[PDB]
Write an enzyme that holds these catalytic residues in place. Structure first.
Site, PDB file in Angstrom:
ATOM      1  N   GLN A   1      17.659  74.161  25.094  1.00 19.41           N
ATOM      2  CA  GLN A   1      18.448  75.084  24.436  1.00 19.41           C
ATOM      3  C   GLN A   1      18.324  75.042  23.016  1.00 19.41           C
ATOM      4  O   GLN A   1      18.023  73.946  22.295  1.00 19.41           O
ATOM      5  CB  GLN A   1      19.690  75.069  24.885  1.00 19.41           C
ATOM      6  CG  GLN A   1      20.081  75.464  26.414  1.00 19.41           C
ATOM      7  CD  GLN A   1      21.441  75.267  26.920  1.00 19.41           C
ATOM      8  OE1 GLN A   1      21.909  74.698  27.772  1.00 19.41           O
ATOM      9  NE2 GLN A   1      22.458  75.889  25.941  1.00 19.41           N
TER      10      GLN A   1
ATOM     11  N   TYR B   1      35.815  28.450  37.542  1.00 15.83           N
ATOM     12  CA  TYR B   1      35.231  28.437  38.923  1.00 15.83           C
ATOM     13  C   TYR B   1      33.609  28.817  38.955  1.00 15.83           C
ATOM     14  O   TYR B   1      33.011  28.452  39.986  1.00 15.83           O
ATOM     15  CB  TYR B   1      36.017  29.541  39.730  1.00 15.83           C
ATOM     16  CG  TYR B   1      37.343  29.170  39.925  1.00 15.83           C
ATOM     17  CD1 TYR B   1      37.611  28.361  40.699  1.00 15.83           C
ATOM     18  CD2 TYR B   1      38.664  30.220  39.614  1.00 15.83           C
ATOM     19  CE1 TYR B   1      38.772  28.109  41.497  1.00 15.83           C
ATOM     20  CE2 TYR B   1      39.683  29.911  40.333  1.00 15.83           C
ATOM     21  CZ  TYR B   1      40.076  28.763  41.172  1.00 15.83           C
ATOM     22  OH  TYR B   1      41.268  28.488  41.769  1.00 15.83           O
TER      23      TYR B   1
ATOM     24  N   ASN C   1      37.622  36.127  47.390  1.00 10.34           N
ATOM     25  CA  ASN C   1      37.813  34.946  46.748  1.00 10.34           C
ATOM     26  C   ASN C   1      36.463  34.294  46.040  1.00 10.34           C
ATOM     27  O   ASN C   1      35.527  34.613  46.542  1.00 10.34           O
ATOM     28  CB  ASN C   1      37.960  33.977  47.926  1.00 10.34           C
ATOM     29  CG  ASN C   1      39.096  34.479  48.792  1.00 10.34           C
ATOM     30  OD1 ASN C   1      39.130  34.611  50.099  1.00 10.34           O
ATOM     31  ND2 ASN C   1      40.466  34.732  48.340  1.00 10.34           N
TER      32      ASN C   1
ATOM     33  N   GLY D   1      43.812  29.990  49.220  1.00 13.67           N
ATOM     34  CA  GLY D   1      43.029  30.874  49.841  1.00 13.67           C
ATOM     35  C   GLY D   1      41.496  30.707  50.069  1.00 13.67           C
TER      36      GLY D   1
HETATM   37  C1  F43 Z   1      50.049  29.890  39.185  1.00  5.24           C
HETATM   38  C2  F43 Z   1      48.832  29.452  40.105  1.00  5.24           C
HETATM   39  C3  F43 Z   1      49.118  30.109  41.346  1.00  5.24           C
HETATM   40  C4  F43 Z   1      48.293  31.330  41.262  1.00  5.24           C
HETATM   41  O1  F43 Z   1      48.362  32.378  41.951  1.00  5.24           O
HETATM   42  N1  F43 Z   1      47.264  31.239  40.178  1.00  5.24           N
HETATM   43  C5  F43 Z   1      47.325  29.878  39.523  1.00  5.24           C
HETATM   44  C6  F43 Z   1      47.400  30.106  38.025  1.00  5.24           C
HETATM   45  C7  F43 Z   1      46.286  31.220  37.895  1.00  5.24           C
HETATM   46  C8  F43 Z   1      45.982  31.514  36.233  1.00  5.24           C
HETATM   47  C9  F43 Z   1      46.338  30.252  35.229  1.00  5.24           C
HETATM   48  C10 F43 Z   1      46.557  30.836  33.811  1.00  5.24           C
HETATM   49  C11 F43 Z   1      47.418  30.138  33.000  1.00  5.24           C
HETATM   50  O2  F43 Z   1      47.700  28.847  32.928  1.00  5.24           O
HETATM   51  O3  F43 Z   1      48.439  30.807  32.326  1.00  5.24           O
HETATM   52  C12 F43 Z   1      44.528  31.823  36.220  1.00  5.24           C
HETATM   53  C13 F43 Z   1      43.551  31.771  34.802  1.00  5.24           C
HETATM   54  C14 F43 Z   1      44.401  33.454  36.679  1.00  5.24           C
HETATM   55  C15 F43 Z   1      44.911  34.459  35.635  1.00  5.24           C
HETATM   56  N2  F43 Z   1      46.018  34.727  35.654  1.00  5.24           N
HETATM   57  O4  F43 Z   1      44.334  34.761  34.629  1.00  5.24           O
HETATM   58  C16 F43 Z   1      43.862  30.762  37.448  1.00  5.24           C
HETATM   59  N3  F43 Z   1      44.844  30.362  38.122  1.00  5.24           N
HETATM   60 NI1  F43 Z   1      44.428  28.791  39.188  1.00  5.24          NI
HETATM   61  N4  F43 Z   1      42.848  28.442  38.192  1.00  5.24           N
HETATM   62  C17 F43 Z   1      41.837  27.476  38.442  1.00  5.24           C
HETATM   63  C18 F43 Z   1      41.998  26.322  39.314  1.00  5.24           C
HETATM   64  C19 F43 Z   1      43.203  25.989  39.999  1.00  5.24           C
HETATM   65  C20 F43 Z   1      43.594  24.608  40.614  1.00  5.24           C
HETATM   66  C21 F43 Z   1      43.734  23.738  39.572  1.00  5.24           C
HETATM   67  C22 F43 Z   1      44.115  22.400  40.330  1.00  5.24           C
HETATM   68  C23 F43 Z   1      43.815  21.290  38.968  1.00  5.24           C
HETATM   69  O5  F43 Z   1      43.772  20.133  39.278  1.00  5.24           O
HETATM   70  O6  F43 Z   1      43.795  21.576  37.882  1.00  5.24           O
HETATM   71  C24 F43 Z   1      44.735  25.088  41.537  1.00  5.24           C
HETATM   72  C25 F43 Z   1      44.560  25.418  42.894  1.00  5.24           C
HETATM   73  C26 F43 Z   1      44.035  24.175  43.784  1.00  5.24           C
HETATM   74  O7  F43 Z   1      44.840  23.070  43.599  1.00  5.24           O
HETATM   75  O8  F43 Z   1      42.949  24.089  44.325  1.00  5.24           O
HETATM   76  C27 F43 Z   1      45.234  26.266  40.869  1.00  5.24           C
HETATM   77  C28 F43 Z   1      46.506  26.651  41.124  1.00  5.24           C
HETATM   78  C29 F43 Z   1      46.973  27.922  40.500  1.00  5.24           C
HETATM   79  N5  F43 Z   1      46.512  28.992  39.969  1.00  5.24           N
HETATM   80  C30 F43 Z   1      48.564  27.964  40.299  1.00  5.24           C
HETATM   81  C31 F43 Z   1      48.974  27.208  39.094  1.00  5.24           C
HETATM   82  C32 F43 Z   1      48.830  25.617  39.275  1.00  5.24           C
HETATM   83  C33 F43 Z   1      49.643  24.885  38.365  1.00  5.24           C
HETATM   84  O9  F43 Z   1      51.045  25.063  38.431  1.00  5.24           O
HETATM   85  O10 F43 Z   1      49.178  24.001  37.360  1.00  5.24           O
HETATM   86  N6  F43 Z   1      44.479  26.798  40.112  1.00  5.24           N
HETATM   87  C34 F43 Z   1      40.821  25.689  39.611  1.00  5.24           C
HETATM   88  O11 F43 Z   1      40.661  24.668  40.636  1.00  5.24           O
HETATM   89  C35 F43 Z   1      39.641  25.463  38.593  1.00  5.24           C
HETATM   90  C36 F43 Z   1      39.680  26.791  37.990  1.00  5.24           C
HETATM   91  C37 F43 Z   1      40.980  27.325  37.452  1.00  5.24           C
HETATM   92  C38 F43 Z   1      40.895  29.011  36.936  1.00  5.24           C
HETATM   93  C39 F43 Z   1      40.535  29.145  35.655  1.00  5.24           C
HETATM   94  C40 F43 Z   1      39.136  29.118  35.353  1.00  5.24           C
HETATM   95  O12 F43 Z   1      37.931  29.211  36.279  1.00  5.24           O
HETATM   96  O13 F43 Z   1      38.595  28.656  34.242  1.00  5.24           O
HETATM   97  C41 F43 Z   1      42.284  29.236  36.926  1.00  5.24           C
HETATM   98  C42 F43 Z   1      42.490  30.516  37.742  1.00  5.24           C
HETATM   99  O1  COM Z   2      22.603  77.952  33.414  1.00 10.26           O
HETATM  100  S1  COM Z   2      23.870  77.199  34.128  1.00 10.26           S
HETATM  101  O2  COM Z   2      24.828  78.132  34.140  1.00 10.26           O
HETATM  102  O3  COM Z   2      23.216  76.856  35.441  1.00 10.26           O
HETATM  103  C1  COM Z   2      24.371  75.947  33.304  1.00 10.26           C
HETATM  104  C2  COM Z   2      24.952  76.027  31.756  1.00 10.26           C
HETATM  105  S2  COM Z   2      25.242  74.466  31.128  1.00 10.26           S
HETATM  106  O1  COM Z   3      47.229  28.261  43.469  1.00 10.96           O
HETATM  107  S1  COM Z   3      46.466  29.270  44.052  1.00 10.96           S
HETATM  108  O2  COM Z   3      45.247  28.700  45.117  1.00 10.96           O
HETATM  109  O3  COM Z   3      47.256  30.333  44.787  1.00 10.96           O
HETATM  110  C1  COM Z   3      45.429  30.153  42.939  1.00 10.96           C
HETATM  111  C2  COM Z   3      44.484  29.384  42.447  1.00 10.96           C
HETATM  112  S2  COM Z   3      43.615  30.097  41.016  1.00 10.96           S
END
Ligand code: F43
Ligand code: COM
Ligand code: COM
Ligand code: TP7
Ligand code: K
Lengths: 247, 432, 564, 565
Positions: free
Chosen positions: C161, C346, C495, C459
């Site tokens: 065009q 993680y 997960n 979980g």
């Molecule tokens: C509030 C929750 C429940 C939930 O639904 N998510 C949380 C928190 C959430 C937040 C924490 C951010 C913050 O500190 O504001 C984030 C980063 C997710 C987000 N919203 O961005 C996260 N966890 Ni969790 N979360 C983690 C993890 C974990 C490990 C930590 C255990 C330890 O001993 O430190 C445990 C689960 C377990 O026991 O297996 C855990 C729990 C939990 N996880 C508990 C909080 C635990 C506490 O009170 O300290 N996370 C991990 O196991 C490693 C990776 C880490 C993630 C951040 C990253 O990957 O860098 C983070 C992944």
């Molecule tokens: O010529 S056509 O009508 O098919 C497309 C115009 S952008």
């Molecule tokens: O503590 S929970 O296992 O529910 C979430 C970890 S990031």
């Protein structure tokens, strides 16, 4: 009749796992009712347990044959709020392991909601029921007050190196070794208490090694409990085969 | 009350004094049996399963090296059909059928009514067939635990990583429910190429089967309630089932030298003769603005006219592409000739505008054969556009790249083997 | 005695000062179970101090606050425990964990954009359309002219065009199209500027395997502008590609600019000859094509190209794990399906400190010694049980021999992902069967649970407890070879600590066998291209470049249209 | 005699030199039907020369060619006809049409990002969960502390766990959360830094109308980082928002960090109290929420804020048209649903040279004189026929009185979109009924077709021929008030030159009535915020700033993490 066997294995770790599962745990320390309420942080120590306040449309008890044959716990009968007890346990031979605190609760306590994670283990239940559980969780050999800590938030520490004093790190400093005893002066979510709760002496390294439900290559290696390794392989193989064809 | 005489694909009387209410998807026994068989019948591509196994291939391009299992499938079609019947049936002697077609390459599977009665949708025709052939092949070749996943992939394709059996070998005339644009579109998601292949490229039967399915869709959508039931049934009878022989006789009269425009003039002359339209008022220039004495019947004459014009224009060129412009200019010229709205009050013309664009541009669509009542380009009319597309596809003598022979070999063979699908006008008239 | 490959990294990250963390005062022994907790907080970390400073500027400028380390629970900032760096595995780069967050790492964002902005479109059906409908002749001369036109038009420039307005080439210089073909006679006549030469990019054996799978077919590896997929989405890519393919066929073959045959070329480019990176997702996690959730694990293995340039089988499988752990856990699960701070560590557990490398080399070396070599171990449950148990128990014990290793991979899910990835990858490489590897992954998960009395987060093990039974199931929504599984496979849809590791396991059987590709030879050839912004032959090296703010091939910036 | 509002722009863009196009030699009379064709090609245009030079650099650097003006069909480059600029309507900015391509205009990309990265989440159900389920007290103090925590956490910073790694605040400084409430007692107690004050942002009458519609409820206007939606998609926004709302409630109320009640807060933030910008699309054009296809026309009218700051009803309606023509035709239809060179000028026709302004002011002034004023004309087919025919025929004739106007809007679809938008907006403003406006749009389309013997591109009028019948239909997939229609309304799902104009018509009935909002009062308040990067009160001024590379609020760049230049 049926005699529960709970779990395979013949090492001290397997024996301790069956102790926690069966509730055959020794009482090593005492906590008063008000000190337990203070450290859980759900209500003022000495106060009555608050009730739920559901909407009018949910007040009615339904005609249910299961409600008629399952007795409510004292907490359910009173309408207590659902509250929790959450523990963090060091991997350096803290007596408790997360799955085994959950198995202890599932086997020995009624109407409980246990949750297992690596760095935290929780039990939610009707408040007075969770306090009955909480008392056993802290007074028995399932806890060492240095290697374990009640933590409803900021749980980090299970897998960290111990402090020079042998206490498991706590970012919120809820409990510490103060003049020959473990003092907890904040509730499980880090709110400062108006009291010091004395959780008693820590276990020695030898006692923790003898009482622990965790395997460690430098204490009781997992590899050495042949029946447990066999049990894992058997469950894996049978689950694999039945998933293909259940026969 | 509205009555019609139903005429055949060859313009012969089949049924007289038929109440259009008796042709409804909700009352007509032949239409109800067509829908029942549409929902319960699935196609298993044994040829596709054989090649997928032998080459470790999933769909058109995926190939997992080292997974080749060169199992002999097609030559064992009758043994496999027997086992598939045992697995698909609910009780011995029930209404399950399994038939081998195309020299062993395909199985036509008709699941028993019991599977549809205990399910919410038609999908058990796919899932029972896919599970049955997967199990039958695992048994016949004593496939071990490690290798059964490759039999599964050869039949079900990428499912469940994909929502459906993408790259698999079990299909239906219908597509998965998740592909519906809205509520009631499942019977509308059928390629025009499938219809033309099923009806053996007989343009009248292609328009009839498409009109039946489109109007079953309009009924399921909620577009045939109250006064709209009469509206859609008049369209079904006059456009889909050659009511009063208007479609066939208009095409015969205009077949030798007719154009889109002469078909417009024939339809206006007929509507005026039949009392469907009359002069409303005459402008100073002498131009006559017409009025519709029966709006719904005028709509049905314009639907019949849209189809007759498609047959005359696409038939003359023996080229399907003319349908998009035929639907547009038949209705645009009809409005300019009479001062009355065209078919579906501008929605056939509107559908044809976008359809023309999306069958002649870079943006999407394709040849007429890929369109359907659920296609975003051609869904807009209330079932009055796709029957013309199906007839146009049938009339094509070889101009299309994506022809029914390319896209609809499986469906065309499987559903085309069923008489009610091949000869829908005859089947509908005979059930009265 | 075998020297663990992670020891050097643990010595550096824990015993040598990083920022002002006073590491030598915490502990100088990587085997010590005790450490001195100094509680330095923000002061120890130049990176956290950079964030704190920007937070002050932001609060002052907007009159509405942002980042503030003291808003951490209890007014206690991050860094009560020693803040340590990470070594990006196989590199000498040491960085803060924040430098590996996808938001802060341009190499990670560019890796996803290069996948998102790519589709592969066949040419054979388009050429057949021109022959059948127009009677046009297609030759290498017409194809080469078409490719020049296409590379001008694809970024957003006009060819038919008058009075068209166009994209600024400086904003879309990452956009181009190359071609490849299994027809060697045609390959020798294609203008070398546009050809991906299969013989040059792959070894003799792999080139023959690719050509046999592709046949005498020709394909366009299209990479639409990064700025377009960033402004829009992955589902834009196949449409953008088809529009400019259509325009280029019109101009190069002097078709009518909008006739019925043009719609056949559109249907061919958009549907019949389209090979995208992934299909759509269902309603709950609705997305169109070319999003991470639709990316099959085998496709990620074919996108990664380390196996094409290294004979080290473990190394090649772990470059796949690094790409997958980052894409699937950090960007996909950590942002598209959740968000916030997200899931950096993680994922980093699978590509830092040479830990997964140590466990995987151990398991693979054990299997090579016992069974003879790669792809020589029988694909049986007896072999899976042997390799996966040996590898898992070795890995479990390393966290106990080295308290610093346990503190580094502090979350149980991090330990589970790495322990099970090593067991699965060693098993897959040894048997040449990735499904055997997947079975090994689930056995390793179960062993870890009973060993530590804990597994992952709340979980974590939904798919692992479902896992053993669903490896070899042939039921409707259970059965599927691992190569075709992906983030939409039901058990895997939610997960962290599994998807990227599964991409490595999917690659493992094929790397063990020496296969040229895992599931799509067209994908493997399309990404064997050094002109792509991200270097898919060295995933971990690229992440390390992004971490230190040295990745210099980031596309899609708008500096040219913003004030200086 | 009324002086047409587009004449000054036609004089500038056609008779005054732009680049080196020698405009005075082409023609100095905007009414002349003839022009001298100089065939200057690339040489006349500094912008095309810029593109040519970048094309050569790209070819040299990569060893694989790119842009080359000589690859245009026949080796004849763009610019055989005079290349002219555009005046962005209501501004003095003169720019090349390429400066209004969405790829080359950061203000346009930032407008879409500010919509894409926004959701509105209720607080009442979350507060009720805290009170009823946990027995926690919610006060202005706890809310204010929660909002400080939330503005730290939302961009990607930690509040509970130890050893978290975080987003660089310098990359996410466009991310924040504000709140608004229909509870005046609570509004007076919320920390003013986070409040969108309804009384300050809207006039007394409009503030009362908003409060009556919202009731005593409180809402969070969340804006997640631009870098996140650019790396990911719009469907990320509600999930990102819910994660950091959940973390902030845990930290601010000292809950267990992961108990059963936390799942109720997640379900409330993600589902029960979520108010996103749009729902998902079906399989053929599959996309999750918060994408342009899911954005209802009334939502775009409520996002735009010109009606809140100007009493000029036509101007306020045309700022909605400008936002919609750009978003729906350039970004959505021109990229998400197609791509390449795309649809810049199909959209610029509705926001350049004051052309749509001339036609809309003419129609509206005609209706005000005849019927008395805004929202005073009866909402009947008689009124629609009158206003839409008068406006459409006036607009049709302007292309014939001014050959330069016809050459500017060279495509029939451009003429159709502008002629019909003016007829629809004049009708909607006069009747106070946007459905009457929609009916007027279809009548104008039909008049234009018979007047010029042509309408738009090949498939332009699919929805217009379907249109008249589907305005007032109540059938399943036909009936719907225009405010709730959008790019997924079946007839509208494919074609340029309609959607943005429909957003203006959706606004017209409500602007005529003086309504505070069109379809969602929560959306109207959430975007009445000067901290948002794009200034939604002055859409055309913002597009003009982007065109001349002066828009200074572009978010999401990665300069801070790239090597220094
Ligand atoms: C509030 C929750 C429940 C939930 O639904 N998510 C949380 C928190 C959430 C937040 C924490 C951010 C913050 O500190 O504001 C984030 C980063 C997710 C987000 N919203 O961005 C996260 N966890 Ni969790 N979360 C983690 C993890 C974990 C490990 C930590 C255990 C330890 O001993 O430190 C445990 C689960 C377990 O026991 O297996 C855990 C729990 C939990 N996880 C508990 C909080 C635990 C506490 O009170 O300290 N996370 C991990 O196991 C490693 C990776 C880490 C993630 C951040 C990253 O990957 O860098 C983070 C992944
Ligand atoms: O010529 S056509 O009508 O098919 C497309 C115009 S952008
Ligand atoms: O503590 S929970 O296992 O529910 C979430 C970890 S990031
Ligand atoms: C029709 C349909 O294409 P398919 O027929 O499915 O290939 C659809 N495209 C469009 O509607 C293109 C709209 C934008 C370009 C035309 C503007 S008038 C889509 O990609 O989903
Ligand atoms: K994006």
């Amino acid at each position: 009749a049926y005699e529960p066997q709970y779990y395979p294995g013949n090492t001290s770790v397997a024996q301790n796992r069956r102790k926690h599962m069966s509730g055959n745990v020794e009482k090593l320390r005492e906590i008063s009712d008000e000190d337990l309420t203070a450290i859980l942080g759900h209500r003022a120590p000495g106060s009555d347990y608050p009730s739920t306040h559901p909407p009018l449309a949910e007040m009615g008890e339904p005609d249910c044959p299961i409600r008629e044959i399952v007795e409510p716990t004292p907490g359910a009968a009173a309408g207590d709020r659902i509250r929790y007890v959450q523990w963090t346990d060091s991997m350096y031979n803290a007596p408790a392991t997360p799955y085994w605190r959950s198995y202890y609760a599932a086997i020995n306590h009624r109407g409980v909601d246990p949750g297992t994670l690596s760095g935290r283990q929780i039990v939610e239940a009707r408040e007075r029921d969770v306090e009955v559980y909480g008392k056993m969780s802290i007074e028995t050999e399932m806890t060492c007050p240095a290697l374990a800590g009640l933590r409803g938030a900021t749980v980090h520490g299970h897998s960290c190196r111990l402090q020079e004093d042998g206490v498991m790190f706590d970012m919120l400093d809820r409990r510490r070794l103060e003049g020959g005893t473990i003092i907890m002066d904040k509730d499980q979510v880090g709110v400062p208490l108006d009291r010091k709760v004395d959780l008693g002496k820590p276990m020695s390294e030898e006692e923790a090694a003898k009482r622990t439900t965790i395997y460690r290559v430098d204490n009781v290696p997992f590899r050495s409990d042949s029946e447990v390794v066999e049990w894992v392989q058997r469950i894996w193989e049978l689950r694999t085969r039945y998933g293909f064809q259940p026969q | 009350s509205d009555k019609v005489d139903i005429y055949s694909d060859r313009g012969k009387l089949l049924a007289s004094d038929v109440d259009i209410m008796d042709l409804a998807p909700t009352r007509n026994r032949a239409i109800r049996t067509i829908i029942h068989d549409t929902k319960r019948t699935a196609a298993v591509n044994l040829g596709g399963i054989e090649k997928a196994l032998a080459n470790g291939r999933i769909g058109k391009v995926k190939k997992i090296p080292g997974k080749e299992m060169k199992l002999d499938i097609v030559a064992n079609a009758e043994r496999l059909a027997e086992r598939v019947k045992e697995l698909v049936q609910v009780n011995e002697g029930d209404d399950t059928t399994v038939e081998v077609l195309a020299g062993g390459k395909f199985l036509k599977v008709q699941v028993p009514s019991a599977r549809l009665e205990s399910g919410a949708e038609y999908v058990s025709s796919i899932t029972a067939s896919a599970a049955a052939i997967t199990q039958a092949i695992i048994e016949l070749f004593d496939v071990g635990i490690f290798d059964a996943c490759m039999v599964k992939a050869a039949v079900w394709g990428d499912y469940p990583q994909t929502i459906g059996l993408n790259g698999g070998n079990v299909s239906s005339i219908l597509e998965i429910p998740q592909k519906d644009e809205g509520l009631g579109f499942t019977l509308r998601n059928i390629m025009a190429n499938h219809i033309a292949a099923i009806t053996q490229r007989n343009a009248m039967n292609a328009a009839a089967l498409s009109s039946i399915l489109e109007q079953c869709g309009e009924f399921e959508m909620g577009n045939a309630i109250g006064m709209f039931e009469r509206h859609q049934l008049l369209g079904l009878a006059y456009q889909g089932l050659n009511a009063n022989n208007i479609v066939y006789e208009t095409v015969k009269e205009q077949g030798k030298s007719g154009t889109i425009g002469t078909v417009v003039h024939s339809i206006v002359e007929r509507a005026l003769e039949d009392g469907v339209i009359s002069v409303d008022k005459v402008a100073p220039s002498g131009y006559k603005f017409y009025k519709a004495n029966d709006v719904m019947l005028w709509n049905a004459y314009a639907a019949a006219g849209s189809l007759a014009a498609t047959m005359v224009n696409c038939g003359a060129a023996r080229a399907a592409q003319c349908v998009s412009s035929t639907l547009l200019y038949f209705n645009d010229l009809l409005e300019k000739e009479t001062g009355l709205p065209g078919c579906d009050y501008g929605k056939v013309q509107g559908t044809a505008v976008g359809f023309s664009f999306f069958s002649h541009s870079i943006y999407g669509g394709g040849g007429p054969g890929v369109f359907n009542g659920n296609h975003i380009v051609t869904r807009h009319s209330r079932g009055f556009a796709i029957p013309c597309v199906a007839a146009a596809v049938a009339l094509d003598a070889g101009t299309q790249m994506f022809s029914p022979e390319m896209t609809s070999a499986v469906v065309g063979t499987v559903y085309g083997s069923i008489p009610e699908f091949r000869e829908p006008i005859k089947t509908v008239a005979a059930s009265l | 005695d075998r020297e663990q490959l992670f020891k050097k990294a643990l010595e550096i990250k824990f015993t040598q000062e990083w920022g002002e963390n006073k590491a030598t005062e915490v502990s100088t022994d990587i085997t010590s179970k005790k450490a001195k907790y100094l509680r330095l907080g923000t002061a120890q970390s130049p990176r956290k101090r950079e964030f704190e400073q920007y937070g002050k500027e932001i609060a002052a400028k907007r009159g509405l606050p942002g980042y503030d380390p003291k808003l951490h629970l209890g007014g206690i900032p991050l860094g009560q425990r020693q803040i340590t760096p990470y070594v990006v595995s196989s590199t000498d780069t040491l960085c803060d964990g924040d430098d590996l967050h996808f938001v802060n790492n341009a190499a990670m964002q560019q890796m996803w954009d290069d996948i998102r902005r790519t589709v592969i479109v066949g040419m054979d059906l388009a050429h057949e359309t021109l022959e059948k409908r127009l009677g046009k002749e297609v030759t290498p001369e017409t194809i080469n002219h078409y490719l020049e036109v296409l590379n001008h038009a694809m970024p957003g420039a006009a060819v038919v065009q008058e009075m068209m307005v166009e994209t600024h080439p400086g904003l879309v210089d990452d956009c181009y199209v190359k071609v490849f073909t299994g027809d060697d006679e045609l390959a020798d006549e294609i203008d070398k500027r546009f050809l991906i030469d299969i013989d040059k990019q792959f070894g003799e054996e792999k080139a023959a395997q690719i050509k046999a799978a592709i046949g005498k077919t020709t394909w366009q590896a299209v990479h639409v502008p990064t700025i377009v997929v960033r402004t829009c989405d992955g589902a834009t890519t196949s449409r953008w590609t088809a529009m400019q393919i259509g325009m280029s066929f019109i101009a190069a073959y002097r078709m009518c600019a909008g006739e019925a045959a043009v719609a056949d070329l559109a249907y061919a480019a958009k549907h019949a000859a389209l090979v995208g990176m992934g299909d759509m997702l269902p309603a709950r996690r609705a997305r169109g094509p070319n999003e991470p959730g639709g990316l099959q694990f085998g496709y990620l293995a074919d996108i990664v190209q380390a196996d094409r340039v290294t004979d080290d089988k473990v190394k090649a499988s772990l470059e796949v794990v690094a790409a997958g752990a980052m894409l699937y856990d950090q960007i996909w699960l950590g942002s598209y399906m959740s968000g916030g701070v997200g899931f950096t560590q993680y994922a980093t557990a699978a590509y830092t400190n040479n830990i997964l490398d140590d466990f995987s080399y151990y398991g693979y070396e054990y299997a090579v010694d016992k069974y003879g070599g790669p792809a020589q171990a029988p694909a049986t449950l007896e072999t899976v049980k042997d390799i996966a148990t040996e590898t898992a128990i070795y890995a479990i014990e390393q966290y106990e021999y080295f308290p610093t290793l346990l503190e580094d991979q502090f979350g149980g899910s991090q330990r589970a992902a790495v322990v099970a990835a090593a067991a699965g990858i060693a098993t897959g490489l040894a048997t040449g069967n990735s499904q055997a590897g997947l079975s090994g992954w689930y056995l390793a998960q179960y062993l870890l649970k009973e060993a530590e009395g804990r597994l992952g987060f709340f979980g974590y093990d939904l798919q692992d407890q479902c896992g053993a039974a669903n490896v070899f199931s042939y039921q409707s929504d259970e059965g599927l070879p691992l190569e075709l599984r992906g983030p939409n496979y039901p058990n895997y849809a939610m997960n962290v600590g599994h998807q990227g590791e599964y991409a490595g396991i999917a690659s493992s059987g094929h790397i063990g066998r020496g296969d040229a590709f895992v599931v799509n030879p067209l994908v493997k050839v399309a990404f064997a291209d050094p002109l792509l912004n991200f270097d898919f032959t060295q995933v971990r090296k690229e992440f390390a470049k992004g971490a230190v703010r040295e990745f210099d091939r980031c596309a899609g910036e708008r500096a040219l249209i913003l004030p200086a």
